[PDB]
Write a protein that binds this ligand. Structure first.
Ligand SMILES: NC(=O)c1ccc(N[C@@H]2CC[C@H](c3ccccc3)C2)nc1
Ligand SMILES: NC(=O)c1ccc(N[C@@H]2CC[C@H](c3ccccc3)C2)nc1
Lengths: 237, 237
Protein backbone atom coordinates (compact mmCIF):
# COMPACT_ATOMS: atom_id res chain seq x y z
CA UNK A 1 0.00 0.00 0.00
CA UNK A 2 3.18 2.06 -0.10
CA UNK A 3 3.51 2.59 -3.85
CA UNK A 4 6.62 3.99 -5.52
CA UNK A 5 7.09 6.75 -8.06
CA UNK A 6 10.19 6.68 -10.20
CA UNK A 7 11.20 9.50 -12.49
CA UNK A 8 13.63 8.68 -15.27
CA UNK A 9 15.82 10.95 -17.40
CA UNK A 10 16.83 9.08 -20.58
CA UNK A 11 17.59 9.68 -24.25
CA UNK A 12 15.83 6.33 -24.89
CA UNK A 13 12.66 6.19 -22.73
CA UNK A 14 11.19 3.39 -24.86
CA UNK A 15 13.79 1.04 -23.35
CA UNK A 16 11.77 1.22 -20.13
CA UNK A 17 8.94 -0.71 -21.77
CA UNK A 18 11.04 -3.77 -20.89
CA UNK A 19 10.06 -3.36 -17.25
CA UNK A 20 6.75 -1.45 -17.58
CA UNK A 21 5.07 -3.82 -20.03
CA UNK A 22 6.20 -7.29 -18.94
CA UNK A 23 6.22 -9.71 -16.03
CA UNK A 24 5.90 -8.89 -12.34
CA UNK A 25 7.03 -5.28 -12.84
CA UNK A 26 4.58 -4.91 -15.72
CA UNK A 27 1.81 -5.97 -13.36
CA UNK A 28 3.02 -3.57 -10.65
CA UNK A 29 2.75 -0.71 -13.13
CA UNK A 30 -0.69 -1.77 -14.41
CA UNK A 31 -1.93 -1.98 -10.81
CA UNK A 32 -0.45 1.43 -9.88
CA UNK A 33 1.88 -0.01 -7.23
CA UNK A 34 4.74 1.38 -9.31
CA UNK A 35 4.79 4.39 -11.58
CA UNK A 36 7.62 5.07 -14.01
CA UNK A 37 7.63 8.48 -15.70
CA UNK A 38 10.25 9.47 -18.30
CA UNK A 39 11.71 12.77 -19.51
CA UNK A 40 13.93 12.89 -22.61
CA UNK A 41 16.67 15.58 -22.80
CA UNK A 42 16.09 15.63 -26.55
CA UNK A 43 12.70 17.29 -25.92
CA UNK A 44 14.55 20.09 -24.12
CA UNK A 45 16.83 21.06 -26.97
CA UNK A 46 16.24 24.19 -29.05
CA UNK A 47 18.52 23.81 -32.07
CA UNK A 48 17.28 22.40 -35.39
CA UNK A 49 19.02 19.05 -35.00
CA UNK A 50 18.07 18.59 -31.34
CA UNK A 51 21.66 18.17 -30.19
CA UNK A 52 22.09 16.21 -26.96
CA UNK A 53 25.85 15.70 -26.82
CA UNK A 54 28.82 18.06 -26.40
CA UNK A 55 32.64 17.99 -26.53
CA UNK A 56 34.69 17.50 -23.38
CA UNK A 57 37.12 20.24 -22.38
CA UNK A 58 40.70 19.00 -22.56
CA UNK A 59 40.07 16.92 -25.63
CA UNK A 60 39.75 13.16 -25.74
CA UNK A 61 37.85 10.70 -27.95
CA UNK A 62 34.31 10.65 -26.56
CA UNK A 63 31.43 13.07 -26.10
CA UNK A 64 29.55 14.02 -22.94
CA UNK A 65 25.82 14.66 -22.62
CA UNK A 66 25.03 18.31 -23.37
CA UNK A 67 24.50 20.22 -20.14
CA UNK A 68 21.53 22.44 -21.01
CA UNK A 69 19.00 19.87 -22.27
CA UNK A 70 20.01 17.40 -19.56
CA UNK A 71 19.83 19.97 -16.79
CA UNK A 72 16.45 21.22 -18.00
CA UNK A 73 15.06 17.68 -18.06
CA UNK A 74 16.24 17.03 -14.50
CA UNK A 75 14.65 20.27 -13.24
CA UNK A 76 11.37 19.27 -14.91
CA UNK A 77 11.38 15.83 -13.30
CA UNK A 78 12.17 17.41 -9.90
CA UNK A 79 9.26 19.82 -10.28
CA UNK A 80 6.90 16.92 -11.08
CA UNK A 81 8.18 14.89 -8.14
CA UNK A 82 7.65 17.64 -5.61
CA UNK A 83 9.49 17.36 -2.31
CA UNK A 84 11.50 14.42 -1.03
CA UNK A 85 12.64 12.88 -4.31
CA UNK A 86 16.23 11.60 -4.09
CA UNK A 87 18.07 12.08 -7.40
CA UNK A 88 20.34 9.18 -8.42
CA UNK A 89 23.02 8.93 -11.13
CA UNK A 90 23.91 5.40 -12.29
CA UNK A 91 27.62 4.91 -13.03
CA UNK A 92 30.61 2.62 -12.40
CA UNK A 93 31.99 5.33 -10.03
CA UNK A 94 28.99 5.03 -7.77
CA UNK A 95 28.30 3.10 -4.57
CA UNK A 96 28.10 -0.61 -5.35
CA UNK A 97 24.52 -1.88 -5.27
CA UNK A 98 23.75 -4.98 -3.17
CA UNK A 99 20.58 -6.32 -1.54
CA UNK A 100 21.13 -4.19 1.57
CA UNK A 101 21.50 -1.12 -0.63
CA UNK A 102 18.31 -2.10 -2.47
CA UNK A 103 16.35 -2.26 0.79
CA UNK A 104 17.73 1.18 1.71
CA UNK A 105 16.68 2.65 -1.64
CA UNK A 106 13.26 0.99 -1.35
CA UNK A 107 12.56 3.26 1.66
CA UNK A 108 12.20 6.19 -0.71
CA UNK A 109 8.71 7.03 -1.90
CA UNK A 110 10.13 8.95 -4.86
CA UNK A 111 13.30 8.47 -6.89
CA UNK A 112 14.69 10.23 -9.94
CA UNK A 113 17.12 8.17 -12.00
CA UNK A 114 19.42 9.97 -14.43
CA UNK A 115 20.65 7.73 -17.25
CA UNK A 116 24.03 8.63 -18.69
CA UNK A 117 24.93 8.07 -22.34
CA UNK A 118 28.18 8.60 -24.30
CA UNK A 119 31.11 9.24 -21.89
CA UNK A 120 28.76 10.39 -19.16
CA UNK A 121 27.81 13.76 -17.71
CA UNK A 122 29.52 16.97 -16.59
CA UNK A 123 30.99 16.58 -13.07
CA UNK A 124 29.40 19.85 -11.94
CA UNK A 125 25.93 18.45 -12.65
CA UNK A 126 26.74 15.64 -10.23
CA UNK A 127 27.71 18.24 -7.64
CA UNK A 128 24.62 20.40 -8.25
CA UNK A 129 21.85 18.00 -9.32
CA UNK A 130 22.70 14.50 -8.08
CA UNK A 131 22.11 13.28 -4.52
CA UNK A 132 23.74 9.83 -4.79
CA UNK A 133 25.74 7.89 -7.40
CA UNK A 134 25.21 4.12 -7.55
CA UNK A 135 26.73 1.31 -9.61
CA UNK A 136 25.05 -2.02 -10.33
CA UNK A 137 28.49 -3.60 -10.60
CA UNK A 138 32.11 -3.22 -11.67
CA UNK A 139 31.59 -3.20 -15.44
CA UNK A 140 31.06 -0.57 -18.15
CA UNK A 141 27.89 -0.27 -20.25
CA UNK A 142 26.80 1.90 -23.19
CA UNK A 143 24.13 3.61 -21.11
CA UNK A 144 22.63 3.99 -17.65
CA UNK A 145 19.22 2.68 -18.73
CA UNK A 146 19.91 -0.98 -17.99
CA UNK A 147 21.31 -0.09 -14.56
CA UNK A 148 18.29 2.15 -13.96
CA UNK A 149 15.89 -0.70 -14.85
CA UNK A 150 17.91 -3.16 -12.77
CA UNK A 151 17.52 -0.85 -9.76
CA UNK A 152 13.81 -0.33 -10.40
CA UNK A 153 13.21 -4.10 -10.69
CA UNK A 154 15.15 -4.79 -7.47
CA UNK A 155 13.33 -2.16 -5.37
CA UNK A 156 9.95 -3.03 -6.92
CA UNK A 157 10.11 -6.42 -5.20
CA UNK A 158 9.97 -4.63 -1.84
CA UNK A 159 6.77 -2.81 -2.71
CA UNK A 160 3.98 -4.63 -0.84
CA UNK A 161 1.66 -6.36 -3.30
CA UNK A 162 4.19 -6.66 -6.10
CA UNK A 163 5.29 -10.19 -5.21
CA UNK A 164 3.06 -13.23 -4.68
CA UNK A 165 19.32 -13.90 5.30
CA UNK A 166 22.61 -13.20 3.54
CA UNK A 167 22.98 -16.69 2.05
CA UNK A 168 22.82 -18.09 -1.49
CA UNK A 169 19.61 -19.99 -2.31
CA UNK A 170 19.24 -23.79 -2.03
CA UNK A 171 18.80 -25.98 -5.14
CA UNK A 172 15.15 -26.36 -6.23
CA UNK A 173 13.49 -29.24 -8.08
CA UNK A 174 10.25 -29.70 -10.02
CA UNK A 175 8.81 -32.43 -12.29
CA UNK A 176 9.90 -34.97 -13.41
CA UNK A 177 11.14 -37.12 -10.53
CA UNK A 178 14.01 -38.37 -12.68
CA UNK A 179 15.72 -36.13 -15.25
CA UNK A 180 18.53 -37.61 -17.34
CA UNK A 181 19.26 -40.13 -14.58
CA UNK A 182 19.24 -37.39 -11.93
CA UNK A 183 16.77 -37.96 -9.09
CA UNK A 184 15.09 -35.47 -6.76
CA UNK A 185 16.48 -35.69 -3.18
CA UNK A 186 14.10 -38.01 -1.24
CA UNK A 187 13.73 -35.53 1.66
CA UNK A 188 11.87 -33.18 -0.71
CA UNK A 189 9.42 -36.04 -1.42
CA UNK A 190 9.06 -37.01 2.26
CA UNK A 191 6.39 -34.48 3.22
CA UNK A 192 8.38 -33.89 6.40
CA UNK A 193 8.37 -30.11 6.59
CA UNK A 194 11.00 -29.70 9.33
CA UNK A 195 13.44 -32.08 7.63
CA UNK A 196 12.97 -30.16 4.38
CA UNK A 197 13.60 -26.81 6.08
CA UNK A 198 16.87 -28.02 7.60
CA UNK A 199 17.97 -29.62 4.32
CA UNK A 200 17.44 -26.39 2.34
CA UNK A 201 19.20 -24.34 5.04
CA UNK A 202 22.13 -26.73 5.07
CA UNK A 203 22.30 -26.55 1.26
CA UNK A 204 22.24 -22.73 1.38
CA UNK A 205 25.09 -22.71 3.90
CA UNK A 206 27.13 -25.24 1.91
CA UNK A 207 26.55 -23.46 -1.40
CA UNK A 208 27.47 -20.10 0.12
CA UNK A 209 30.58 -21.63 1.69
CA UNK A 210 31.72 -23.22 -1.56
CA UNK A 211 30.93 -20.35 -3.96
CA UNK A 212 31.02 -17.17 -1.88
CA UNK A 213 32.85 -17.90 1.38
CA UNK A 214 33.43 -14.20 2.04
CA UNK A 215 29.64 -13.82 2.46
CA UNK A 216 29.72 -16.01 5.59
CA UNK A 217 32.10 -13.56 7.28
CA UNK A 218 29.47 -10.85 7.09
CA UNK A 219 27.19 -13.10 9.12
CA UNK A 220 26.61 -14.01 12.74
CA UNK A 221 25.26 -17.54 12.31
CA UNK A 222 22.59 -18.99 14.59
CA UNK A 223 23.56 -22.11 16.57
CA UNK A 224 21.52 -24.12 14.05
CA UNK A 225 23.33 -22.54 11.10
CA UNK A 226 26.74 -23.13 12.73
CA UNK A 227 25.84 -26.80 13.19
CA UNK A 228 24.53 -27.37 9.66
CA UNK A 229 27.55 -25.61 8.15
CA UNK A 230 29.94 -27.78 10.20
CA UNK A 231 28.02 -30.86 9.03
CA UNK A 232 28.28 -29.78 5.38
CA UNK A 233 31.99 -29.01 5.63
CA UNK A 234 32.50 -32.43 7.27
CA UNK A 235 30.60 -34.30 4.54
CA UNK A 236 32.32 -32.31 1.80
CA UNK A 237 35.70 -33.22 3.34
CA UNK B 1 35.22 -7.98 -37.82
CA UNK B 2 34.68 -10.61 -35.13
CA UNK B 3 30.91 -10.40 -34.75
CA UNK B 4 28.98 -12.06 -31.93
CA UNK B 5 25.91 -14.26 -31.93
CA UNK B 6 23.83 -14.41 -28.78
CA UNK B 7 20.99 -16.84 -28.28
CA UNK B 8 18.46 -15.99 -25.61
CA UNK B 9 15.90 -18.19 -23.84
CA UNK B 10 13.19 -15.96 -22.32
CA UNK B 11 9.47 -15.92 -21.53
CA UNK B 12 9.57 -12.22 -22.52
CA UNK B 13 11.70 -11.86 -25.69
CA UNK B 14 10.22 -8.43 -26.44
CA UNK B 15 12.20 -7.05 -23.49
CA UNK B 16 15.31 -7.47 -25.64
CA UNK B 17 14.11 -4.68 -27.93
CA UNK B 18 15.63 -2.39 -25.29
CA UNK B 19 19.09 -3.33 -26.50
CA UNK B 20 18.36 -4.37 -30.11
CA UNK B 21 16.47 -1.24 -31.15
CA UNK B 22 18.27 1.60 -29.37
CA UNK B 23 21.63 3.29 -28.98
CA UNK B 24 25.06 1.81 -29.63
CA UNK B 25 23.80 -1.77 -29.26
CA UNK B 26 20.91 -1.00 -31.60
CA UNK B 27 23.45 0.11 -34.19
CA UNK B 28 25.58 -3.01 -33.64
CA UNK B 29 22.54 -5.16 -34.38
CA UNK B 30 21.52 -3.15 -37.46
CA UNK B 31 25.08 -3.43 -38.80
CA UNK B 32 25.26 -7.19 -38.10
CA UNK B 33 28.16 -6.87 -35.64
CA UNK B 34 25.84 -8.37 -33.05
CA UNK B 35 22.97 -10.78 -33.52
CA UNK B 36 20.45 -11.53 -30.78
CA UNK B 37 18.08 -14.43 -31.41
CA UNK B 38 15.33 -15.40 -28.93
CA UNK B 39 13.44 -18.61 -28.14
CA UNK B 40 10.39 -18.55 -25.85
CA UNK B 41 9.64 -21.66 -23.73
CA UNK B 42 5.96 -20.80 -24.13
CA UNK B 43 6.21 -21.80 -27.81
CA UNK B 44 7.38 -25.24 -26.68
CA UNK B 45 4.39 -26.06 -24.52
CA UNK B 46 1.69 -28.49 -25.65
CA UNK B 47 -1.18 -27.98 -23.21
CA UNK B 48 -4.12 -25.68 -23.97
CA UNK B 49 -3.02 -22.94 -21.59
CA UNK B 50 0.65 -23.06 -22.59
CA UNK B 51 1.86 -23.66 -19.05
CA UNK B 52 5.44 -22.55 -18.37
CA UNK B 53 5.69 -22.90 -14.59
CA UNK B 54 5.60 -25.87 -12.21
CA UNK B 55 5.49 -26.59 -8.45
CA UNK B 56 8.67 -27.22 -6.49
CA UNK B 57 9.06 -30.56 -4.74
CA UNK B 58 9.16 -30.10 -0.97
CA UNK B 59 6.60 -27.34 -1.01
CA UNK B 60 7.29 -23.66 -0.54
CA UNK B 61 5.66 -20.45 -1.78
CA UNK B 62 7.02 -19.94 -5.29
CA UNK B 63 6.96 -21.73 -8.63
CA UNK B 64 9.84 -22.90 -10.81
CA UNK B 65 10.02 -22.77 -14.60
CA UNK B 66 8.50 -25.93 -16.10
CA UNK B 67 11.25 -28.32 -17.16
CA UNK B 68 9.92 -29.62 -20.49
CA UNK B 69 9.23 -26.36 -22.37
CA UNK B 70 12.41 -24.79 -21.00
CA UNK B 71 14.57 -27.78 -21.83
CA UNK B 72 13.12 -28.00 -25.34
CA UNK B 73 13.81 -24.32 -25.96
CA UNK B 74 17.44 -24.69 -24.83
CA UNK B 75 17.97 -27.70 -27.12
CA UNK B 76 16.55 -25.70 -30.04
CA UNK B 77 18.86 -22.75 -29.39
CA UNK B 78 21.84 -25.13 -29.10
CA UNK B 79 20.96 -26.74 -32.43
CA UNK B 80 20.79 -23.30 -34.09
CA UNK B 81 24.10 -22.25 -32.56
CA UNK B 82 25.98 -25.29 -33.76
CA UNK B 83 29.27 -26.10 -32.06
CA UNK B 84 31.15 -23.99 -29.55
CA UNK B 85 28.27 -22.08 -27.95
CA UNK B 86 28.76 -21.67 -24.20
CA UNK B 87 25.43 -21.83 -22.34
CA UNK B 88 25.05 -19.33 -19.47
CA UNK B 89 22.46 -19.10 -16.68
CA UNK B 90 22.08 -15.68 -15.02
CA UNK B 91 21.46 -15.85 -11.26
CA UNK B 92 22.57 -14.43 -7.89
CA UNK B 93 24.31 -17.81 -7.21
CA UNK B 94 26.58 -17.35 -10.18
CA UNK B 95 30.12 -16.03 -10.61
CA UNK B 96 30.14 -12.28 -10.00
CA UNK B 97 30.49 -10.32 -13.23
CA UNK B 98 33.20 -7.64 -13.43
CA UNK B 99 35.08 -6.02 -16.33
CA UNK B 100 37.67 -8.82 -16.37
CA UNK B 101 34.86 -11.37 -16.55
CA UNK B 102 33.27 -9.38 -19.38
CA UNK B 103 36.49 -9.48 -21.42
CA UNK B 104 36.65 -13.26 -20.82
CA UNK B 105 33.06 -13.73 -22.01
CA UNK B 106 33.70 -11.48 -25.01
CA UNK B 107 36.16 -14.12 -26.30
CA UNK B 108 33.21 -16.35 -27.16
CA UNK B 109 31.88 -16.16 -30.69
CA UNK B 110 28.57 -17.68 -29.56
CA UNK B 111 26.69 -17.47 -26.27
CA UNK B 112 23.34 -18.81 -25.14
CA UNK B 113 21.77 -16.93 -22.24
CA UNK B 114 19.02 -18.64 -20.25
CA UNK B 115 16.73 -16.18 -18.46
CA UNK B 116 15.13 -17.46 -15.28
CA UNK B 117 11.69 -16.36 -14.11
CA UNK B 118 9.67 -17.15 -10.96
CA UNK B 119 11.89 -18.88 -8.34
CA UNK B 120 14.31 -20.05 -11.00
CA UNK B 121 15.00 -23.36 -12.70
CA UNK B 122 15.41 -27.03 -11.74
CA UNK B 123 18.93 -27.70 -10.40
CA UNK B 124 19.35 -30.72 -12.68
CA UNK B 125 18.94 -28.49 -15.75
CA UNK B 126 21.91 -26.49 -14.48
CA UNK B 127 23.88 -29.72 -14.20
CA UNK B 128 22.83 -30.99 -17.64
CA UNK B 129 22.29 -27.88 -19.79
CA UNK B 130 24.25 -24.99 -18.29
CA UNK B 131 27.99 -24.43 -18.77
CA UNK B 132 28.46 -21.44 -16.46
CA UNK B 133 26.33 -19.47 -13.98
CA UNK B 134 26.98 -15.72 -13.70
CA UNK B 135 25.57 -12.93 -11.53
CA UNK B 136 25.58 -9.25 -12.45
CA UNK B 137 25.65 -8.42 -8.75
CA UNK B 138 24.53 -9.33 -5.24
CA UNK B 139 20.85 -8.45 -5.58
CA UNK B 140 17.63 -10.29 -6.52
CA UNK B 141 15.52 -9.46 -9.58
CA UNK B 142 12.18 -10.69 -10.96
CA UNK B 143 13.85 -12.18 -14.02
CA UNK B 144 17.14 -12.94 -15.73
CA UNK B 145 16.36 -10.74 -18.74
CA UNK B 146 17.87 -7.54 -17.33
CA UNK B 147 21.04 -9.41 -16.31
CA UNK B 148 21.14 -11.03 -19.75
CA UNK B 149 20.87 -7.62 -21.46
CA UNK B 150 23.43 -6.13 -19.08
CA UNK B 151 25.88 -8.88 -20.07
CA UNK B 152 25.14 -8.45 -23.78
CA UNK B 153 25.66 -4.67 -23.57
CA UNK B 154 28.96 -5.09 -21.67
CA UNK B 155 30.44 -7.64 -24.10
CA UNK B 156 29.11 -5.77 -27.15
CA UNK B 157 31.52 -2.93 -26.36
CA UNK B 158 34.42 -5.31 -27.03
CA UNK B 159 33.17 -6.18 -30.50
CA UNK B 160 35.39 -4.24 -32.93
CA UNK B 161 33.36 -1.58 -34.72
CA UNK B 162 30.68 -1.25 -32.06
CA UNK B 163 32.31 1.70 -30.29
CA UNK B 164 33.47 4.96 -31.86
CA UNK B 165 43.38 0.06 -16.30
CA UNK B 166 41.51 -0.94 -13.14
CA UNK B 167 40.80 2.61 -11.99
CA UNK B 168 37.64 4.73 -11.68
CA UNK B 169 37.24 7.39 -14.40
CA UNK B 170 38.33 11.04 -13.98
CA UNK B 171 35.75 13.87 -13.80
CA UNK B 172 34.77 15.24 -17.24
CA UNK B 173 33.57 18.73 -18.18
CA UNK B 174 31.78 20.27 -21.15
CA UNK B 175 30.14 23.65 -21.89
CA UNK B 176 29.59 26.07 -20.24
CA UNK B 177 32.86 27.26 -18.72
CA UNK B 178 31.03 28.29 -15.55
CA UNK B 179 28.04 26.33 -14.23
CA UNK B 180 26.32 27.57 -11.08
CA UNK B 181 29.55 29.24 -9.97
CA UNK B 182 31.56 26.09 -10.68
CA UNK B 183 34.45 26.56 -13.11
CA UNK B 184 36.19 24.06 -15.37
CA UNK B 185 39.74 23.23 -14.14
CA UNK B 186 42.13 25.55 -16.07
CA UNK B 187 44.43 22.65 -17.08
CA UNK B 188 41.62 21.30 -19.27
CA UNK B 189 41.53 24.70 -21.04
CA UNK B 190 45.33 24.94 -21.36
CA UNK B 191 45.73 22.89 -24.55
CA UNK B 192 48.71 21.24 -22.87
CA UNK B 193 48.09 17.60 -23.67
CA UNK B 194 50.69 16.08 -21.32
CA UNK B 195 49.53 18.18 -18.36
CA UNK B 196 45.94 17.12 -19.07
CA UNK B 197 46.89 13.44 -19.23
CA UNK B 198 48.64 13.58 -15.85
CA UNK B 199 45.78 15.56 -14.30
CA UNK B 200 43.15 13.00 -15.39
CA UNK B 201 45.35 10.10 -14.23
CA UNK B 202 45.89 11.75 -10.87
CA UNK B 203 42.13 12.33 -10.56
CA UNK B 204 41.44 8.68 -11.43
CA UNK B 205 43.89 7.53 -8.76
CA UNK B 206 42.49 9.92 -6.15
CA UNK B 207 38.88 9.04 -6.93
CA UNK B 208 39.65 5.31 -6.80
CA UNK B 209 41.51 5.78 -3.52
CA UNK B 210 38.68 7.74 -1.93
CA UNK B 211 35.71 5.66 -3.18
CA UNK B 212 37.07 2.18 -3.85
CA UNK B 213 40.41 1.81 -2.06
CA UNK B 214 40.27 -1.99 -2.30
CA UNK B 215 40.59 -1.63 -6.10
CA UNK B 216 44.12 -0.21 -5.71
CA UNK B 217 45.25 -3.40 -3.97
CA UNK B 218 44.49 -5.39 -7.10
CA UNK B 219 46.95 -3.19 -8.95
CA UNK B 220 50.68 -2.94 -9.50
CA UNK B 221 51.01 0.80 -10.06
CA UNK B 222 53.54 2.28 -12.47
CA UNK B 223 56.14 4.64 -10.97
CA UNK B 224 54.11 7.52 -12.43
CA UNK B 225 50.89 6.24 -10.84
CA UNK B 226 52.61 5.74 -7.47
CA UNK B 227 53.85 9.33 -7.60
CA UNK B 228 50.51 10.90 -8.60
CA UNK B 229 48.67 8.89 -5.95
CA UNK B 230 51.13 10.02 -3.25
CA UNK B 231 50.65 13.61 -4.44
CA UNK B 232 46.85 13.29 -4.23
CA UNK B 233 46.93 11.71 -0.78
CA UNK B 234 49.27 14.52 0.35
CA UNK B 235 47.00 17.28 -0.99
CA UNK B 236 43.90 15.59 0.40
CA UNK B 237 45.60 15.41 3.82
N1 LIG C 1 27.87 -0.32 -13.68
C1 LIG C 1 26.91 0.64 -13.81
O1 LIG C 1 26.02 0.86 -13.00
C2 LIG C 1 27.02 1.43 -15.04
C3 LIG C 1 27.81 0.98 -16.06
C4 LIG C 1 27.89 1.76 -17.19
C5 LIG C 1 27.20 2.94 -17.27
N2 LIG C 1 27.36 3.65 -18.46
C6 LIG C 1 26.74 4.95 -18.47
C7 LIG C 1 27.01 5.54 -19.82
C8 LIG C 1 28.23 6.41 -19.69
C9 LIG C 1 28.37 6.74 -18.24
C10 LIG C 1 29.74 6.39 -17.82
C11 LIG C 1 30.42 5.40 -18.48
C12 LIG C 1 31.69 5.06 -18.09
C13 LIG C 1 32.28 5.71 -17.05
C14 LIG C 1 31.60 6.71 -16.38
C15 LIG C 1 30.33 7.04 -16.77
C16 LIG C 1 27.42 5.85 -17.48
N3 LIG C 1 26.43 3.38 -16.27
C17 LIG C 1 26.36 2.62 -15.18
N1 LIG D 1 21.94 -10.78 -9.89
C1 LIG D 1 21.61 -11.46 -11.03
O1 LIG D 1 22.35 -11.65 -11.97
C2 LIG D 1 20.25 -11.98 -11.02
C3 LIG D 1 19.34 -11.51 -10.11
C4 LIG D 1 18.08 -12.03 -10.14
C5 LIG D 1 17.74 -13.00 -11.06
N2 LIG D 1 16.42 -13.46 -10.99
C6 LIG D 1 16.14 -14.56 -11.87
C7 LIG D 1 14.69 -14.91 -11.67
C8 LIG D 1 14.64 -16.02 -10.66
C9 LIG D 1 15.99 -16.67 -10.67
C10 LIG D 1 16.47 -16.71 -9.27
C11 LIG D 1 16.04 -15.78 -8.37
C12 LIG D 1 16.49 -15.80 -7.07
C13 LIG D 1 17.37 -16.78 -6.68
C14 LIG D 1 17.81 -17.72 -7.58
C15 LIG D 1 17.36 -17.69 -8.88
C16 LIG D 1 16.92 -15.78 -11.44
N3 LIG D 1 18.62 -13.46 -11.95
C17 LIG D 1 19.85 -12.95 -11.91
Amino acid sequence: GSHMWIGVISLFPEMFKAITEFGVTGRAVKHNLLKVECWNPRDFTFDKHKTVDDRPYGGGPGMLMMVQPLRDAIHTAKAAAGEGAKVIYLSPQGRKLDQGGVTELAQNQKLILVCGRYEGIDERLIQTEIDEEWSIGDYVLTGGELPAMTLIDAVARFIPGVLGDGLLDCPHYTRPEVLEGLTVPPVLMSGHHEEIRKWRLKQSLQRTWLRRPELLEGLALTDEQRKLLKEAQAEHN
